[PDB]
Design a protein around this ligand. Structure first.
Ligand code: FES
Length: 56
């Protein structure tokens, strides 16, 4: 699904960024742009990031 329409970021792309080495929400945002435009998706993006980091 699209977490972030403004930047075309899907949930699987967020997970990809983490499995590829991103270790924080800030890094996922820098890698993908998630949440940087209107900001409205940030809470959902943060949830995906934290759950995926805990599952490494
Ligand atoms: S939906 Fe993600 S920044 Fe607008």
């Amino acid at each position: 699904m699209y977490v972030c329409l403004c930047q075309g970021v899907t949930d699987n792309q967020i997970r990809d960024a983490i499995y590829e080495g991103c270790c924080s929400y800030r890094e996922v945002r820098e890698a993908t742009g998630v949440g940087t435009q209107c900001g409205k998706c940030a809470s959902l993006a943060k949830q995906v990031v934290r759950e995926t980091l805990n599952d490494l």
